[PDB]
Amino acid sequence: SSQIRQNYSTEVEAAVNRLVNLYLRASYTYLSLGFYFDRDDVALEGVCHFFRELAEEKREGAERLLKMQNQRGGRALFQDLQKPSQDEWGTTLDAMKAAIVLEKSLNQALLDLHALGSAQADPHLCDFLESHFLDEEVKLIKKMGDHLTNIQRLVGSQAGLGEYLFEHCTL
Amino acid sequence: SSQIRQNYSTEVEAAVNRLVNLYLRASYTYLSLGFYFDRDDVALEGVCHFFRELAEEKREGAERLLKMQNQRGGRALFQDLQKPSQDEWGTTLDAMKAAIVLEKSLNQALLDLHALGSAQADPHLCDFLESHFLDEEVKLIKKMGDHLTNIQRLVGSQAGLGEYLFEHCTL
Amino acid sequence: SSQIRQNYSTEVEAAVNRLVNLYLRASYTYLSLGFYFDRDDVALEGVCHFFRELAEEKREGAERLLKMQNQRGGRALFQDLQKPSQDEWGTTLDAMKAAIVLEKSLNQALLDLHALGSAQADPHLCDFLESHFLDEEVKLIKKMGDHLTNIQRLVGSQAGLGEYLFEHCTL
Amino acid sequence: SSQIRQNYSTEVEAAVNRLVNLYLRASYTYLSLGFYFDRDDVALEGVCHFFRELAEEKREGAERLLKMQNQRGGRALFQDLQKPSQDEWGTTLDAMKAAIVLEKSLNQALLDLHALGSAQADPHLCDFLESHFLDEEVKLIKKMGDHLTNIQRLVGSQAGLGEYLFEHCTL
Amino acid sequence: SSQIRQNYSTEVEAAVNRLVNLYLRASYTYLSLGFYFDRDDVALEGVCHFFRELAEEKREGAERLLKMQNQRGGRALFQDLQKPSQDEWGTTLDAMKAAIVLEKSLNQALLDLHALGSAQADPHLCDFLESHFLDEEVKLIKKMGDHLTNIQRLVGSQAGLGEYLFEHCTL
Ligand SMILES: [Au+]
Ligand SMILES: [Au+]
Ligand SMILES: [Au+]
Ligand SMILES: [Au+]
Ligand SMILES: [Au+]
Ligand SMILES: [Au+]
Ligand SMILES: [Au+]
Ligand SMILES: [Au+]
Ligand SMILES: [Au+]
Ligand SMILES: [Au+]
Ligand SMILES: [Au+]
Ligand SMILES: [Au+]
Ligand SMILES: [Au+]
Ligand SMILES: [Au+]
Ligand SMILES: [Au+]
Ligand SMILES: [Au+]
Ligand SMILES: [Au+]
Ligand SMILES: [Au+]
Ligand SMILES: [Au+]
Ligand SMILES: [Au+]
Ligand SMILES: [Au+]
Ligand SMILES: [Au+]
Ligand SMILES: [Au+]
Ligand SMILES: [Au+]
Ligand SMILES: [Au+]
Ligand SMILES: [Au+]
Ligand SMILES: [Au+]
Ligand SMILES: [Au+]
Ligand SMILES: [Au+]
Ligand SMILES: [Au+]
Ligand SMILES: [Au+]
Ligand SMILES: [Au+]
Ligand SMILES: [Au+]
Ligand SMILES: [Au+]
Ligand SMILES: [Au+]
Ligand SMILES: [Au+]
Ligand SMILES: [Au+]
Ligand SMILES: [Au+]
Ligand SMILES: [Au+]
Ligand SMILES: [Au+]
What further fact does the record state (chains A, B, C, D, E)? Predict the structure, then answer.
């Protein structure tokens, strides 16, 4: 509230609420991804667990943003959460590509908020994004790109399968 | 006997004896499955161990039913145990499909006994089935459906093999 | 009270209070049983302890019912507790037979409450009885029937005494 | 299969399958014995436990034979398992006599298989029976004969009961 | 020597020396197998280790026979050790087939010595072979037959590879 609020624009407050919505939508997407891979007719438990852990990470991201909104004296406002873009997610390849697209969209929202913070001369906001969000997204996206390459290699060819097994079983 | 027996119909007592027979038949089927996969010309030790553990689970199920029959004051009666439906069990795929068919048949007998208990207004019976049988069967059948999917994926294609290896070796 | 009460009929509330009365009456009966076997002219300390432990079990049963009555928003009402049916309890055989009759009467009250719960479509009540009462009564009644048989065998004959000693001292 | 099988006659393979059937039948007999002594109107828990442990021993015997059949390259074949000879087992005396008769029948089958092994010049078979079966049966039969004597002594007379108590309580 | 020697025929003494030669030849064969799989252009270290452990087992077998020859008062005589049948061993499949052929030849020599012992009425010899050789050979041959099946399955087809991976990676 107005008792503590200092150098915290209405533009940033609003964008923070919208980012919270995006992270919770992402978390819901990952919940859907996770339970799809849990289906008896899909049955890739490691993929289910990968996506379910991401759902938790995304929710934790929204919660840190909400805590920050209150620390700055803004008002947390919650919007409807849109259901995920698909009801069935295809193969592991299709799923990881959708995951990367999703993370890139969050990453772009983080950068757009960083840009707003910079235009509003709000260094606390930039510091907050730097310390808790930007590097984490870069690391996750790298890990997903890695996974995508390995899925493609494995599902593509027996040269691919061969190189994977040597790396994973011998090295 | 008649000293303790209360609210325990002759219909339920009989059906309990028949269920015991079905669980021991299932256990014998799994013993046969297990030793088939132990053959030098089949030699899938993990499959042998999976089926042998199920044989133990099924016997434990029959033993809990027998203990319950005595706790309610009914008379345990034993019938001939029919030998398993096959002498050789084919591939891992063929075996897991036969296992699922078998479990579904036990599950249906459990539900038919639950229905009888309900028509006989025997809440202790329902509670007993709920606490020790229905959820266990659902979980086992899910695990078998999972296994079936993974066997099908692995024996089907190099996309399938690829996705399996990524899940199992990378995630 | 009316702040929490949901799907909890007046019929069930009343029957719960009456069941509480029956369990406390049973507990009082067992207290009397216990101290009878403590008399210097009876002096069967193990029987005294068996009955005194049952008095505690029955009181604990009434207390769980009272806690449940409050959790559902009903009003615990207490009635006079009738004294036990006898002032002296005869032999161990006479006492264990009276105990079994007593437990069967509680068991029947539990089943009658289960029936009412079912007619009132109160699944929480059924679950509560299933999880804390029905199986416990069945197990206790079985144990009492066992004890009755062994008392009868021991007080009956030297074949009986003989078989008991072999079971208890050799096996 | 034929890849490993060496010096293992079809006569021995068949007799091994039949012995497996006999040990599983014995195990089923002991399961029936055990639950009979568990009845509320019989209620000799130590006898129930004695017979139930024997059911496990007999099943373990059949399992070792099945493992050996596969180690030698023979084919495990399973037959119907006949239900036990009685539905009710009488007294402890009647039960232990039936147990001894049963063990003697297994012992004779072991000796008949040893004889066949010897006529087929199969030293591995003889060694297997020597190391896992013959001595175990002799020890069990001795223990049962001991038990029979003590049951007879106890159920017979007060000289008998007296000598038992001195042995068991003083020595 | 003649100071201790009792019931130990010259026929058995000679055959024991010849069996020692066969076990040392087998050990030398396995040494060759092991170092072949160690070649940089073969490079299957687990196979190298399997065969090298068998070379040690075979040498230990010859050493137990030599110790027994002295315990019975016979004279250990050593003969030239023929080099292995091949200088290069082909694939893992070719190698395991040659290993099984080799073990079957030792097994047959053990049985032929057992037969001689029996014709010479030498029960100590039979006991020695029973306790240290016959069962060990049966177990090893079974394990090799198992390995052969799995190699064949793996090198044969992607159904085969698939079933192997499910067994080994999921179960
Ligand atoms: Au899952
Ligand atoms: Au998961
Ligand atoms: Au800034
Ligand atoms: Au920034
Ligand atoms: Au900055
Ligand atoms: Au590996
Ligand atoms: Au790997
Ligand atoms: Au691997
Ligand atoms: Au096995
Ligand atoms: Au196994
Ligand atoms: Au019911
Ligand atoms: Au039910
Ligand atoms: Au129910
Ligand atoms: Au792996
Ligand atoms: Au794996
Ligand atoms: Au792996
Ligand atoms: Au007392
Ligand atoms: Au007491
Ligand atoms: Au209900
Ligand atoms: Au109920
Ligand atoms: Au219910
Ligand atoms: Au004793
Ligand atoms: Au005793
Ligand atoms: Au005693
Ligand atoms: Au029992
Ligand atoms: Au028992
Ligand atoms: Au023999
Ligand atoms: Au023999
Ligand atoms: Au022998
Ligand atoms: Au004693
Ligand atoms: Au005693
Ligand atoms: Au005693
Ligand atoms: Au090496
Ligand atoms: Au090596
Ligand atoms: Au001999
Ligand atoms: Au021999
Ligand atoms: Au022998
Ligand atoms: Au694996
Ligand atoms: Au594996
Ligand atoms: Au693996």
Answer: In horse spleen the light chain is the major chain.
Bridge partner residues of B81 (DSSP):
D81
Q: How many CB atoms lie within 10 A of CB C153?
A: 19
Question: Residue A83 has which token pair?
Answer: 């259901």
Amino acid at A162: G
> Which residue in B107, B125, B133, B110 sits closest to B9, CA to CA?
B125
Gap between the Cα atoms of B95 and B102, Å rounded: 10
Our measurement of the distance from residue C4's CA atom to the centroid of its chain's CA atoms, rounded to an integer in Å, reads 30
Gap between the Cα atoms of C162 and D157, Å rounded: 9
CB burial of B112-124 (b: ≥16 within 10 Å; e: otherwise) equals: ebbebbeebebbb
Distance from CA of E94 to the nearest CA of B (A): 17
Ligand 6 center from residue B169 Cα (angstroms): 7
Counting ligands in written order, the one closest to the CA of B42 is 9
Cα torsion angle, B96, B100, B101, B105, sign = positive
- Residues with Cβ within 8 Å of B106's Cβ and at least 6 positions away in sequence, in order, are B22, B23, B26, B58, B137
Residues with CB under 5 A from ligand 20 (ion): B 123; C 114, 126
List the domain boundaries for chain A.
Answer: 10-170
With beta carbons under 8 A apart, name residues in chain E contacting D72: 138
Cβ atoms < 10 Å from Cβ of A1: 8
Q: From the CA of B31, how many Å to the nearest CA of chain C?
A: 31
Contact B110, B133 (CB under 8 A): yes
Resolution in A: 1.9
Question: Per the structure block, which two tokens stand in for E139?
Answer: 């177990």
Please give the distance, rounded to the nearest whole angstrom, from the Cα atom of residue C170 to the centre of ligand 30: 10
Q: Which chains touch E (3 or more CB pairs under 8 A)?
A: B, D
Query: How many CA atoms does the CB half-sphere of D142 hold within 13 Å?
Result: 6
Q: What is the largest CA-CA distance in chain A?
A: 65
Q: In sequence order, which ranges of chain C are alpha helices (DSSP H)?
A: 10-37, 45-72, 92-119, 123-129, 135-156, 158-165
The SS3 assignment for D81 reads: strand
| C118 contact residues in B (CB cutoff 8 A) | 121
DSSP A51: H
The residue length of chain A stands at 171
Interchain proximity D126–E129, CB inside 8 Å: no
How much distance in Å is there from the Cα of B123 to the middle of ligand 19? 10
Measured torsion, CA atoms of residues B100, B102, B106, B108, in degrees rounded to the nearest 10: 70
Alpha helix positions (H), E38-91: 45-72
Alpha-carbon span C17 to C70, nearest angstrom: 11
Show which residues on chain C lie within 8 Å of chain B, measured between beta carbons.
100, 104, 107-108, 111, 114-115, 118, 126, 129-131, 134-135, 138-139, 141-142, 144-145, 148-149
Instruction: For residues D2 and E105, give the distance between their C-alpha atoms in angstroms, rounded to a whole number.
Output: 15
**For an interface test with B, which of D30, D51, D75, D89 has the most B Cβ atoms less than 10 Å from its Cβ?**
D75
CA torsion sign for A93, A94, A95, A98 is: positive
What's the CA angle centered on B133, arms B101 and B8, to 5 degrees?
115
Count the residues in chain D: 171
**Class (C level, CATH) for E10-170:** mainly alpha
Three-state secondary structure call for residue E105? helix
Distances (CA, A) of C55 to C60, D24, E83: 9, 46, 85
Using an 8 Å Cβ cutoff, are D161 and C162 in contact?
Answer: yes
Q: Is A80 left (phi over 0), alpha (psi -120 to 50) or beta?
A: beta
Residues 6+ apart with CB under 8 A from E41: none
Amino acid present at E138: V
Query: Is D51 within 8 Å of D95 (Cβ atoms)?
Result: yes
